[PDB]
Each structure stands twice: as C-alpha cells, then as structure tokens.
Homo-oligomer: 381 residues x 3
C-alpha cells in the first residue's frame, strides 16, 4: 500500500540515527532507533517491491563480495541497481579495500576465521581512500557474517518475528529457545546463536540458550545478552538440555555450531595448509558431536512448546534427517509443517541487506523512499 509505506516513512523520519557515519558490524553497537531504522526501511522496500514499484537507486555501480573461507547479498544489490562482482589476505586488506572500491558502492564480507579486526580495517581503509580523494564514494560495508555476529541473519530473523507476531511490542514476554542441534557437518560458526541472543535480548524477550557441555558461546557475547535483557525488561537464561529450553517456548531456533576452540584450531591449520591436520580435526569433531545426536528437533520436542505449536526458525539450508543427511537438526515432518515459515524468514534477508546499504548512504533514508514511492516506476513492464 501507498498508505503502509507512507506510515513507514513517517516512522523512519522520526528516528535518530548515525548509521550514515559508521559501519553496521555488530547489532549491539547500534542504538534501538538505528536497529528500528533498518527494520522499517527493509519493510518499506519489501512493500514497494511487492506492488511492482522499482527501488532502483543506482544507475551504475558495483557491489563487491569478499569471502574469507549465498543469494541474499546479490539479491539486495540488484534490488537497488548495483551489479555484483566477487573477489577471487589479512595482511593486505587495506590495499585490497581501495583496489576493489573505485566503482563500488557496497562491499559485502563473509568471514569464517577465528583468532580473537578485518572488517574494521576495511572500513578504516575505505575512510582513508575517500578522505584522500582516491574513492569518489565511500562504499557501504556489509557484514555477511563474522566470528562474532551475523547481523544480516539476526535482523532478518527479527523482521520476520515482527511480521509474524504483528509488532515489536508483541515480542515482549515471548520465550525464544536458541538451542544447539546436531549436524553431520563439523565447524559451523558461532555467529548465528551469538547474533540471536545478542539481538533478541534487546526487545524484552525471554531468551533461553541451550547447548551440550563444551559448546559455550564467546563469553563477551553472553555478557552482552545478559546486560541487554536487564535494560530491555527481558530475561536471559542458560540451560543444559534442549527439552528445558523448548518447554513453554513461543519460538524455537535449533541450530548446530562448533565450539569456538574448535573454530580456532580449524582456522590455524587452514592458514597453514595442513590438510592432514584438518581431516584429523574433522574426524574428532564428528565424534564429539555424535554423542549429542539427541539434540534433534522432532515432533516429540515440538509437543513440549507452547500449545505444542511454537514458531520453528532456522536459516536455510537446514540439515533435515533422512533427506539432506541420515541424522540432522530437524526431522522431515517438522520441517514440512514449518517450511513456509522458514521461507518467509529467509525472504527478509535481501531487504535487510539493502536497508543497511541505504542506511549508510543516506542520512535520511525516509526521504529516498518517499521519492521512490512518488516516482512509482514499475519494476516489470
């Protein structure tokens, strides 16, 4: 609706934001108004797109993809009119940042390395190239996933929660279980669960985190979650069993990850081409994980949630038992029931990424949307 978008624009224009002066790396480094800006902008873009109104903001320009280690970033670039180009390294990051940015209005970085920086160096390098007149524009920087957070996934998940439940206010008092789940694939990043507990705790939700012993998340993020919950009127709890977390839950998000000590050692020999050390590491982790195969989102597990009908969430693809693999994170039956939910959840990501790009490029994204809405250029003829 023109009405829906007009209301979104009034909401956006009323917000105080400085996203135009910084990079959206971690959700917990953004204020509540800034988070709300990205969500509302994403909502306006999705609604415009739904009614065949073009949201093309760039007539030319590149969005670069940099991978330190699938469709959302490319979709977001294309939505705004940018063309994607992939990059086919920590020590040289600064020179590479400038080299790829002459005609780039966005750079998206997916980073798998755990060592206890990279994207902050990229941002400082972009600032330098722009301030010294090397770059005609300062590219927007998109965190497509780092060792600490996965803001693009977490924000899209929150945008979906807000659609599903009707508002952000309606999320207060809702119980969400962020749990581990078994995967045949070792070495999944801790970015997602950290991103979830880091963000959800800011909206007064009752967040329960559950995982087997040894799979602890980074201590600094746990402490952010606890402090977020205090200030937003929510709660944060850590438990040792999946059932514990699932009981009376409104929302379950059962997804595998590797211990961060594993990711560290994987990273070290990944850097050293130690292929044999790898297969040795992989072989062990697969054995550590196999004793927790019972962390499996089954019909029996869902029965314990509120009304036995919690909203099931997971980022796509999921490891579906008997489909994708022999034993995975969720059964065929539970996935079939919630398939449309998980699709709608994923559908928000391109809009969230596009909103992040716009929020860096325009101090007042609400002005830009009103312009797009008034021109009402068709997307398809």
């Amino acid at each position: 609706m023109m009405k829906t978008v007009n209301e979104l624009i009034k909401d956006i224009n009323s917000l105080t934001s400085h996203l135009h002066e910084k990079d959206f790396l971690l959700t917990w480094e953004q204020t509540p108004d800034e988070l709300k800006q990205v969500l509302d902008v994403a909502a306006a873009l999705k609604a415009l797109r739904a009614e065949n109104i073009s949201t093309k903001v760039f007539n030319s320009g590149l969005g670069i993809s940099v991978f330190r280690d699938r469709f959302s970033y490319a979709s977001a670039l294309n939505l705004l009119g940018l063309a994607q180009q992939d990059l086919d390294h920590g020590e040289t990051v600064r020179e590479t940042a400038n080299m790829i940015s002459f005609c780039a209005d966005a750079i998206g970085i997916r980073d798998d390395m755990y060592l206890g920086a990279y994207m902050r160096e990229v941002g400082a390098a972009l600032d330098d190239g722009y301030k010294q007149g090397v770059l005609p524009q300062r590219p927007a920087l998109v965190n497509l996933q780092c060792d600490i957070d996965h803001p693009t996934q977490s924000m899209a998940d929150l945008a979906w929660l807000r659609e599903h439940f009707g508002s952000l206010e309606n999320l207060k008092g809702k119980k969400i279980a962020m749990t581990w789940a078994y995967s045949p694939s070792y070495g999944k990043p801790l970015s997602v669960p950290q991103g979830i507990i880091g963000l959800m705790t800011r909206f007064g939700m009752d967040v329960t985190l559950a995982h087997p012993e040894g799979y602890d998340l980074i201590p600094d993020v746990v402490e952010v979650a606890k402090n977020n919950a205090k200030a937003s009127g929510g709660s944060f709890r850590q438990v040792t069993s999946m059932e514990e977390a699932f009981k009376d839950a409104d929302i379950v998000y059962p997804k595998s990850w590797a211990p961060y000590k594993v990711m560290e050692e994987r990273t070290e020999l990944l850097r050293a081409n130690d292929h044999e050390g790898l297969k040795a590491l992989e072989k062990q982790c697969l054995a550590q994980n196999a004793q927790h195969k019972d962390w499996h989102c089954t019909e029996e597990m869902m029965e314990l949630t509120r009304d036995g009908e919690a909203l099931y969430m997971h980022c796509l693809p999921a490891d579906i038992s008997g489909v994708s693999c022999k034993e995975g994170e969720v059964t065929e039956g539970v996935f079939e029931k919630y398939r449309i939910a998980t699709y709608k959840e994923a559908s928000w990501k391109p809009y969230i990424i596009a909103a992040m790009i716009l929020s860096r490029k325009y101090a007042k994204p609400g002005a830009l949307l009103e312009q797009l809405l008034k021109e009402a250029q068709e997307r398809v003829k």
Copy 2:
C-alpha cells in the same frame, strides 16, 4: 522494421496459448499455437534488437542458473533486463527452489542426470511458494537441457530453419537427417537428437534418424516422433547408416551422443564419487565409439545430399577433425563452408530463451511487444 514487428504482433495476438500457466519443459507437451508463439516472439525480439530498440522488460530482478552436472541464457536474461546469478541435490530441490527465488524472475536448469522429475519438482515448489505468498512472483522456469529434451536448442534450430527456408510451410516435405557422428568425448546427452526428432516431426518434415547399433534413443521419444509425423503429414524413418540418411537430404544434423545405458551408469557412479569406476567407464566407451569413427561429416558425405548442398546444422561447439581434435564429427573444410550457417543457427538461442520467459510471464506477449515497439527506447545511446 516497424512493419515486420507489427505483423508479428498480429500473428501472436491471434494465437491460443496457455504457456502462461505452465512450464515449457518438453516441446511435445506444447500445442502448435504455443510453439508458434515462442517462435514469433523470439522473431520480434530479434528484429527489435537488430534496429537498436530496447527490449528491457525488468528494471531489476535475477535469473538464476542451476547446473546438475553456455552464453545463451545469460544473453537472454540481459536482453530482458535481468541479472544472472549462478548456483554454486534432488532430495532438497524443493527448499532450494524457494531459497533462490525471492528476487528471481527466471530460473534456468541444465540437467545431465539419467535415472528414469527434477524440473517438475522445481515448478511445483515455485507454485507453492507463490500461492502461499512466500514468492512475490512465480519465476519462469527454463529447461536448459534435460535427459529427455533440449527445447531451447531444438526451438532455436527450428527458428533458424524457418528463417533459412523462409517459412514453416516451406518446411513441409523437406528431408532432415538427424544422424550420429563420431566424438572423442564420451558421454554426450541424448537430449539433442531426441529434441530434434520430437520437434521436427511436427511440421510435416521427412525426418530420418540414423545411428550405429546400440545408440538407440529413448523408446518413448521415438514413439512421439512416429506419432507426430502421422498427424502433421510428415514421415519418420530409422536407418543404420549415415549415407542412407544423407542421401537426397535437404538438411543434415550430424552430432554425437552416448547410449542411454551409458549415461545411466555414468550418473550412478557420478553420484557415488567412484572416480576409478568413471575412468574405467570412460576408457570403455572411447573404445566402443572408435569403431564408428567413420560416422564423419566429410565433403564426400555432403556430395550425397540434395544437389550436394544440404544445409549443415550443429549446435556449437562442434568437434572439428584436425582442429579441435584428431578425429571428430565434421571436417575442417565442411565446417568452413557452413560456418556462417551454424553461427546464425546459434544466434537464435538467446531470443528463444527470452521468448520462453516472456511467454510464461505474460498471457499476451503481443501486448508487451507492441508497448516496447511504441516506446522505441534505444538500446545504445
């Protein structure tokens, strides 16, 4: 010409089609009007493009490429204004279809697997995502090649025949020899010859299929060909020698393929990572094929065709003896003579693919072309 295109549009508007409600997987599942629609739309797009008129229909949107196993699909997407994105699996096809389609207006699938489905599951999954409101558009589905048919190649070949010979009516009574030819490369799909005999038999042509013993096409397609010929006033004949087929031919199409029993076993160990079984299979096939090296389109062979001047057809690239390889499907001399013909033949493919996309998206593609023609936006400034 504006006149040429105006006549094409009147032709298109007079046709009865339901391509907007189904996927163009097999040419023989389409009616004669529906085939004619794709051909006429492709012709209008080619003519518009030739006189520097933009045929951009999308201001943003993705076309996804999915490969189960080169330039035409990307060219077609770009012609209409879509950006190509490739996918870098049968069991998970449904979830993948939705995951890649949020911002896609087209999906192109090239499928090499022989097992006796995939694209029909994709289509049903797209229908589901659209009907449940996951996908804001139902993407057009393009068969870039399957185990059964290669409609994109066969239709472009027919569009060329129609240009070369002047009309579809002029194709009645023309003899076309679809023959095997020797290739150093084992494991070429049976899609092309099946596609050719499945389509050409619908236009009253005299279709002769020839191949060594053991290289039989799928029985179901042979029967479609025979039944097509009956109803269109054409003929279909199977012969055991290349000369037999070439004699008095108006058109020759001499191209290698592997027996379907070979493709089956290749597929099985391809799925099982049996690299050793592969090199063993390859080694044998190369020996089976080498006894038919004589299936070679030479100057001597062309002399037997009508006037010794049949139109030579082949999809690009061809295995050219002494150029691409030691011994192949056609000699350097015959290819040099027909090179421009084979280039023009290939030039139709992007237009055919684009016409298929448009034919799914618009019930009346003739309306859309008239709009494009009236706006007459330049392609190049």
Copy 3:
C-alpha cells in the same frame, strides 16, 4: 565541472582518429591523436562520474571476459551499462569469438601465452560475423594484457602521470626509471615494462630501463622505444643497475618480470600438462631470481631520486616485503608513503578501458559525451 568536460569535448572533437575502424591492441600501433583521444575521453568519463552524472550508454548488452591463463574491466563495463560474463583454444578462437558475441558489445582478453596472433584472429572473426550479418554489432575488443603489451595498464599510468604532473607537455624532460624488482613469484609477464617503455618514449620523456642480466625485454619492443624517443624528442637508455636508473629520477616504476625465454618454456609445458616440468621450472627460476633480491625499492633507493622524492609507481598488487611476503619489490615504509599515489594510479584503469570501448563504438566520442553531459542523468538517486 561542466566547464572541464566542455573543454575536454572540444579537445576530443578536434582530434583525428580512426580507432572506430580498428582494435587497440598495441599503443605503438596508434597515432598520437588516437592516444590523446582515449586519455581525454577517460578524463571526461572520470569527471562525469565524480559529479554523479551517469555515463550509461547501453541499456542492455554483454561484455565478455576471456582468460588465456581483476576488477578494472568489470568496472568499465558497468560504468557504461554493460553486464560482465566470463568465459569458463587458439585453434578454435574464431568459432568461439562468434559464439560469445551475439549479444556482446565488448570482449576483454587477458593472454599469458608466449610463443612468438590470438587477438588479431578474434578481431578478424568479429569482422567476419558482423560483415556476414551474424553479429548485429561488432564488439569492441579490449587487450587486457598480452605477451607484448599491456595498453590498459600503460595508458592508465600515463593518464595518472598527466594528472599528477598537470599536463602532457609537463612530461617532456621528466626522467622515468622502469626497473626490474625482486619477486618471490616467478613467471610475471614482460607486458608491463614493454608497455611502459613503448608508450612513455612517445612523450619526450627520458626513459631509463634497468634489469639484471638475462631479463632482457623482447628486442622488437626495445627498438620501438628507441625509435619513439628519437621522434618525440625524448631519450631511451638501458642500464645494468637499479641505482643507476633511480639517480635523479622523477618517476620510478620498479616491478618484477620473468625472462621471455622462461615464459616460453612455461607456456610449452602449460600446454602439455607437464605438472612435474612446471614445479621443476618454478624451482629453478626462484633460484635465478633470488640472486637479485637486492633489486628492492627501499627508502635508501628513493633517497637517490630527484630531491629524494620521485613519484613511485606500481600496478597493484605489489609484493611488499614483510607484509605480502618475506622479501619483495618494495618495503612497507616506501609503500605506506606512496600508497595514495598507487591507488590514484590504479583508479584510472576503468576509465581508460571504458574510453577504449567508446572509441571503437563511436567515430566521434565527443558527441556522445556532450549528450551525456546535457542529459545529466544522476548515477545515484
């Protein structure tokens, strides 16, 4: 400025050029007016882009990348509105050229092979396809690097020299040292130093070439350099030491390359899949190069140049000692000092490549720029 661009257009319109009738393969096959056209067009595009004016000339169309063996070509295509598509062979070049060009307005070729042709065959094949009506447009051909020249790099380097020093006239009498420098990576092409001495000698500069014994450039290019210098009032000198070349230099360009006899043998076994011969060749070259590790652009070396403040040039990436590698072409400290210079130098490449494409497509690129300037369509909304 509108004024700056208006003056550039008057400059361009006053030039005599036939670049619209040939391919820009080697800078020394172009006249001085033709070189100046590319430079001035590149300058106009850069200035337009800087003030948010769209230089989109194509509403659809492909630019193909062909690699015989990173961001500039894609950036240039996108600047003009073309979409990049990569090609994933000498004997079949002619057929491939047509096959990829139906919807291409540009083809970019990077060629690493040394054997004593390829791009000239591509150009003749494009001419044929266009003249016989196969191709609706004759694609522009861009040399992204060959065994002989790297015009795209050399022209961007000259465009930067002209910006840095203020004019082409201001380059007369300037001393530029094109020297070898040590790299841990064997097998760098001789294209760059040949391109530099082949071009710079045409503007009355005092060009000094320096390298260890055995690293001689192709004799034919050396002779072009010597003859260029004579006719432009410059000089060309060959020396045996880096210090010799660096002394009193205004500009230093210290970059590694392999002897051309090495590149020949690398090419031969590259064609023959001789992996073992390769590692054997690599192992030897690394030992030949290691005795010249002293060819290192250090702070001490820079002190010998004019005022100890020569402009340092290098194409990106550089091998930076202690950063990219243990020992390389330039120290961390010298690179930090000149980093912005090398970035600005690289920033010209997309504009140079785009100017080459425009210079082939329009006999009078000045007309096209005036049109772009008058429309003043925004790049970003």
